Amino acid sequence: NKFSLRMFGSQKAVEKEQERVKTADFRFYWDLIMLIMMVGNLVIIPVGITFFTEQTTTPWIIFNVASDTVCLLDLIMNFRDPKVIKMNYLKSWFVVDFISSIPVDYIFLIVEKGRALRIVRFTKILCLLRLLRLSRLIRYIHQWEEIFHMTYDLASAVVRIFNLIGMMLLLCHWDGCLQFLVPLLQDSWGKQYSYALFKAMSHMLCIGYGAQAPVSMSDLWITMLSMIVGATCYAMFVGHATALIQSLDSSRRQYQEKYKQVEQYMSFHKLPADMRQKIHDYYEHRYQGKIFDEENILNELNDPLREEIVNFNCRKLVATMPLFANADPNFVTAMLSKLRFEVFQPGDYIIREGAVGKKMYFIQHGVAGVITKSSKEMKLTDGSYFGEICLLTKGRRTASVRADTYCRLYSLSVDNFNEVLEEYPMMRRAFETVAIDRLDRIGKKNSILLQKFQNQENEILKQIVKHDREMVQA
Amino acid sequence: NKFSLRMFGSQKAVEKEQERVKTADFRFYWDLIMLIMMVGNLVIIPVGITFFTEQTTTPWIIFNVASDTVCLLDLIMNFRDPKVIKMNYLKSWFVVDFISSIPVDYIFLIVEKGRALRIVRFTKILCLLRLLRLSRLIRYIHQWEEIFHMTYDLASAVVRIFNLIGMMLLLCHWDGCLQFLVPLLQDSWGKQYSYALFKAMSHMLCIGYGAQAPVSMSDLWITMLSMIVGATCYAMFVGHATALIQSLDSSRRQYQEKYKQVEQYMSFHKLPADMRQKIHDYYEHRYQGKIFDEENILNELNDPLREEIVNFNCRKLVATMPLFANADPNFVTAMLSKLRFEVFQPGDYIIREGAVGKKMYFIQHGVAGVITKSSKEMKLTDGSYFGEICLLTKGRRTASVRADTYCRLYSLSVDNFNEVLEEYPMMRRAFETVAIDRLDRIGKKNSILLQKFQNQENEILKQIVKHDREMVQA
Amino acid sequence: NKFSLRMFGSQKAVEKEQERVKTADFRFYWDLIMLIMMVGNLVIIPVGITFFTEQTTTPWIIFNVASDTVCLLDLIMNFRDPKVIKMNYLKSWFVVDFISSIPVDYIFLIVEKGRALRIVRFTKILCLLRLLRLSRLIRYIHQWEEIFHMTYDLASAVVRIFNLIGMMLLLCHWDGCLQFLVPLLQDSWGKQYSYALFKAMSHMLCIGYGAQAPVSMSDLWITMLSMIVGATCYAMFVGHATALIQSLDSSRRQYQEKYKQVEQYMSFHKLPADMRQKIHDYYEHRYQGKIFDEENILNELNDPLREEIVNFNCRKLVATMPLFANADPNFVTAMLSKLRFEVFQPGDYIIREGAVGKKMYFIQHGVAGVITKSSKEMKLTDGSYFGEICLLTKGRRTASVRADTYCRLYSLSVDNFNEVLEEYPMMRRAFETVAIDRLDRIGKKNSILLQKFQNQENEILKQIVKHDREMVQA
Amino acid sequence: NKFSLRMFGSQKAVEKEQERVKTADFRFYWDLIMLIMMVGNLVIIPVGITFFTEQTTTPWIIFNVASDTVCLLDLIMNFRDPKVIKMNYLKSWFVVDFISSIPVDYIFLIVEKGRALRIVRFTKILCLLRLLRLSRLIRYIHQWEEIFHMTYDLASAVVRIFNLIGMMLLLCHWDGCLQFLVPLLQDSWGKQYSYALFKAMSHMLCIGYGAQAPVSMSDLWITMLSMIVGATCYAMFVGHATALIQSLDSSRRQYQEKYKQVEQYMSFHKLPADMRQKIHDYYEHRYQGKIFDEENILNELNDPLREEIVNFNCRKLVATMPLFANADPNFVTAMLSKLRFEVFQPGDYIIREGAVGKKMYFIQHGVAGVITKSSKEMKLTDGSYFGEICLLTKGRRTASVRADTYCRLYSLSVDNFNEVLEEYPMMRRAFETVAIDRLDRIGKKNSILLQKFQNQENEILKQIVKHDREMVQA
Ligand SMILES: Nc1ncnc2c1ncn2[C@@H]1O[C@@H]2COP(=O)(O)O[C@H]2[C@H]1O
Ligand SMILES: Nc1ncnc2c1ncn2[C@@H]1O[C@@H]2COP(=O)(O)O[C@H]2[C@H]1O
Ligand SMILES: Nc1ncnc2c1ncn2[C@@H]1O[C@@H]2COP(=O)(O)O[C@H]2[C@H]1O
Ligand SMILES: Nc1ncnc2c1ncn2[C@@H]1O[C@@H]2COP(=O)(O)O[C@H]2[C@H]1O
């Protein structure tokens, strides 16, 4: 079944576990059903035994007896190299739970057949054993919520938290049932049940009442346990509600804290108002108000996943310029995997003429204008690259580039560019032809690039150069 | 309109979205107005229907009917490739909201025209549909608060949090309105309204009262919902107030925690009291009691922003000594971008004669005294550099330097200095001339530097050397 | 004794401390016993003095007098280079504590022997001095909990937290004792004690009561201190309960926050549903829902511990293929220490033919299929390595590798592989022989590897190659 | 005065600020005194105006009038390039505060000289202006607590937090004063004041009372503000108390969380019980249960501070073996600065014979035994180094070393050792002589080291070698 694969985590380990079991599950599902039944019975017991004057061989009493027998069978199954482990498990918790899971109803029936009634019904408080089984069961459903990782959809945050607070409300209803039982031991059924539920809600809300003077010491202790259990109800409710609220607020509070650290730095260095506003604008236009570590996220993923994420992010980039389209997938995906993300505001000079360059930019969003002396301006739209001339020649920049609209680029470092272009020689001549044509259009001269640039591959490179020149001619 | 640019985040994407829409906003503003009106109506409904005995065709009843018609029109617009999406949206939430947004007032009027009054007015509880629309609306105003990034000014922390706690107070007033309606269903207008508001405030404050014995099961349930909604009011109020308080608390608590980690380290290594106080003094004199990661902050900004921040920080540095003023902007901005920040206390020996040097220091605040044998002392004030002789010669230091006042310097590493000076050869001879003059003033020997240092550029270098010697002569 | 070793942290420092003491513990155990006795006496004093009308030379009064004498002896011992330190300690806290630890019972007995009774018994409020000693004692048991690092077993989280909340309950019982004493000063023993305990529990639970009008100013102040001490009881209880709850909550909340950051990244880049599901599947199949930093954890451990952890993790890996079994332990443990962990889903192509490789993989879980042209498919099961051909030849990959089941691999980088193989030359010939046989089986040609690969060691290498070919023949 | 240095942060900036002021403090101290007086007056006003039937030209009324005049003078001083700034400051907050700081007592006296009494005394509610000045003052004392950085001693955590909670208690007393004033407007002095304080405390602890039916709308609003201000008192008290508690809790919770992450890793890899216990023992013996990042802490300190910290940590190390004592301070401090800290349990093999070594160990705590074939064992105590032979010869290790007691070592990497020993050639021959003598004692061959090792400096090296051999012989 799927239980073996879920427990092992993979088919290969599940097959080995099955083979080992055969050489030497459904029981888990039966245990889950028994745990649900035991939780229901443990909820009903304070509301059933206290409310009912006597069992009177009721059909619900028969159902409770059947549930107790099922719990005893579950304990026996849990009790069952193997002998020593079974003995240790029995001596650890199983013996105590089995003794505390004695058939109190059957014992009372036998005693009656063979004040005293209240003492006998006090043995029905052995539902605390079912509550201990329910603590094992909440551990189990924690394991199951691990199995249902996030129910495969965290559409509205923790939805299992709704079940947790529902269980807390059920425990608080148990507290109210005990509070109702206290005067029952001290001294219309639907109306009484609703009144008890309302009293439980009021106690959880600490509305206030004039009840006091328990007189009986046992009654005083009963009110003491009622008060402390109501306190635990309040504490659990407030803790879970505050946890949810703090998670919902933290969703933005993480970014708010990071930007508050940024603001602290800006206030230390005392930047002018305009510079502060520009930094704020860049932060909002880059992170969009979200929190992540792109380097860390892509580092902690394996190679194929990072490869496919990067190939998806720049799909329009690889589709737009023909140089990537004609190229083989290996080089394309390597060059993609070595790209980094940057965003430039209008007016920022990405590359200044006469500077020493260290990276190449691919435009994915926006348009950037190349300007230089005596050659007028010309703009590079989406899906085009600039900075190849300095990278190939290893010299000073020839023309300046300026962002005139909010633009999103990917930058390729000099080391990564040289490494990739060395492990794929053909794209070196491709970029050389493109850069020679581009620089001839610009009007400058480049002897080293022409010397370096000096068949079907040649025709493909010429076509790519023509297409790139036509696209950049805008 | 500006809505397209705000949604797309840039003009380039906004234009593409507009072109796509034309090939195939104001509605957003109308939806915002309708959401505000619906929030007002949902606030008024518990206070209006419960308080008023009957609608009686009042002008406010006409306004409520108009608001219901507007909500129905909004639902119809939300309902309206496109057919399948519209059908899915209708089957998901739109159909249920539209059914729950039925004209209860019109239906009641038709029934009256064609105990029963209370049952008919119970259909006005369909304002829960308007409350669901208001949940969509708080999601929308979360989106809008993202649009108004931080209202462009976080002068007094989260100011939107004030609106959030005001909305929480409005919800708690809704709870009080329900609490007032409970005895109205069970069994001077301004005075009654104020009394109800005071009762709501008291319930939120859990002052306490003798109210009990709802008798009616519906009345008991009404008090139950009143209690739980008051509990949610309390939880939301305490959560938001605590978050607000802890923001300001954490503003200083982050630095306190970092320094407590420092103190834990300092206690682990068991440093003396004087060294403990010296470390504390350095921490207070460097970080000024603020938390940031200068390396991380400057790393996560793009190149022009980091360039302008660094060029602003060292403005007095670049302006003060003529070597930077005469130089071209590219070299100046690069070498500034490679500087690091270090603060030295008085008495600390920055550079000891005979040691092997690895960095060069530019003084931005304070004065440091150069001392060595037989040449007396001489002091370097703001805007001057020391450490060039070792960097150029690649040998041992020639004179010792000692901070005599709390000083703030920027240090340039050996690798960065060699890289920058290699990509800009002219400043190599500039620093060589300056260092040769300085060492001739000191009286040591720099034969390697003299050999390395051995037109208009020469005259400019000589003038820079003379100015640097005159400034350092103090 | 073990106290010296526990305080010093090692036997070497303990011996030096013992030698220094001899040249110039059990007292710690006696101080612990005295602190326990003082805590018991400080708990009993509000419940004993207030409840009892007079001491009447009771046996418990004799026990209290003996405890006071023991406390005085402890103070004297604490009072006792050494003279100056003792004087400073006496002038700091010891003198005040000793004065406040005066024998109030003996003084009262002497005064009686030589309204006034209440004034004399007010001197018994000097149990606040024992409470100050108990504050020193809670500091001491914090030190002891550091000595019992985590009791050597954190089986059920902080178990010392149970003792802390028990002490908080004891303090709240002290508050209730003061609340009982308030009307005793203003104006069946077991029943009264239980009633007082119930009143204390109710005050901690803020149930509410009609008690008011203290009339006496001292009575009003007594109720004021009772209220504020109940406030501290409530605050401490809620704080410790919330910390306990949030520990277990954070155990899963840390992973949930990391995956929420991943989800924010995924929502920013707008990946399709299938890609989001694949990323979620990889995250759940790699981290298993746990939080750690394998690099950080293995970095902050010393070399032998990391060595043994890594040697344990790959025990089946080293045992399975004979190449590691025949090898000397040094090379095996080094190459294991340089392995990294990766996990590949089915369908993912680990190595594509024609790509440039930078790492080679060892399979520890799952099976991966080698496929290439004209040679059909063949599957590599657990305990086998692929990718050595590219590493040795320093060329393009020869065959493609595809994961067909969820597989867990360790990868060895190119730099680490070359460094290890250079510091151990024999395994280079071993891998060369194995890879030459493997590539001959594949059907391609490798001249460089054959030239590089061109005694008992040779026979062992041939046997290892035959075994590896037989294992990979599946 | 010291105010200029405190504000500027250094003497150099303070002198420049003083020169600029002279070209164009005590006022700060006067403002502090005025703020303290205004806080006292704002505390007294709810307790003075409400309690007193009329001013009656009392001496305390004269004092209040003087305080109001002082506040007016402070506002005038705050009001006083400079004209525009003063006008902007006046139009921002100063005008409103000055108008609200009108002499209400003088105005009432003039009106009386020239029901109505209550209306006139309602103008004394202008103490809200003093409360706004007190908010400016709490901002100011936040600045002052930044000036008193941690009061120069965080002996018992945040002691300023005690003042903060005292101010919160004062605000809650203000709330109680308003609560007392509410029935005073609706309808033995020490007894009444104590009763009001007790009522304020009871409201703070929400004990509960039968007060209700305000009748008057103004009375109902008064109880409403009283309730909300009491709620703010409760929220501030619980927030500050929880922050205080969680500081001490987090002091150990941070280490507990790090070790819980370690335990999660250990459970993920499923290490045996003995290995888990060994890892726990190493963690407790290395970190001693403390949280820090030695690399980060030493990285964020400047060079002289790190130099002195490291020179202090290894004081016994540098003093013990004579090689460091004879050496010049520069080399000693550099090689100390490049040391790292490690700790080895007994039984761990630090260096195994036949392995390739990459670091050298200096013993600072404990003893490690060198063992090898045919040469028996011999032990290296505190203050001695091993690993020099492999570092100098760049070959395999010659003998194995084993920790037999919990030992603390400093390790010096191969790159750092080669760098330091290259920049200081003399210690190369020193270590060569020592290692040659040591290996001759061992009985192996070091022909390369002997060739490499082949005046006063020679005599010093020989003496150092003899002393090192004598120390190692033990
Ligand atoms: N005339 C042109 N046509 C197309 N691209 C150009 C032209 N002139 C300059 N560029 C690009 O602009 C870049 C600016 O920096 P580089 O000189 O490194 O490389 C340059 C080319 O990539
Ligand atoms: N006579 C001098 N005039 C100016 N600067 C000096 C003089 N002597 C030394 N210095 C500076 O002090 C520095 C000390 O270290 P360096 O030798 O690396 O480089 C030295 C110069 O920068
Ligand atoms: N016939 C074969 N038998 C065993 N292993 C192979 C065979 N063909 C390819 N491989 C392995 O598959 C790997 C794929 O990448 P490499 O060429 O780097 O190295 C290859 C070998 O490790
Ligand atoms: N006879 C000896 N006397 C002192 N030290 C030794 C002796 N033999 C080995 N050692 C030390 O033990 C170290 C073990 O590793 P290395 O060979 O790198 O360097 C060795 C020396 O530092």
Numbering used by the authors:
A (entry chain D), B (entry chain A), C (entry chain C), D (entry chain B): 107 to 130, 140 to 195, 209 to 242, 252 to 324, 340 to 606, 616 to 635
What text does the study give?
Hyperpolarization and cyclic nucleotide (HCN) activated ion channels are critical for the automaticity of action potentials in pacemaking and rhythmic electrical circuits in the human body. Unlike most voltage-gated ion channels, the HCN and related plant ion channels activate upon membrane hyperpolarization. HCN channels are also regulated by cyclic nucleotides, which act via the CNBD and fine-tune the frequency of their pacemaking activity. Here, we present cryo-electron microscopy structures of human HCN1 corresponding to Closed, Open, and a putative Intermediate state.
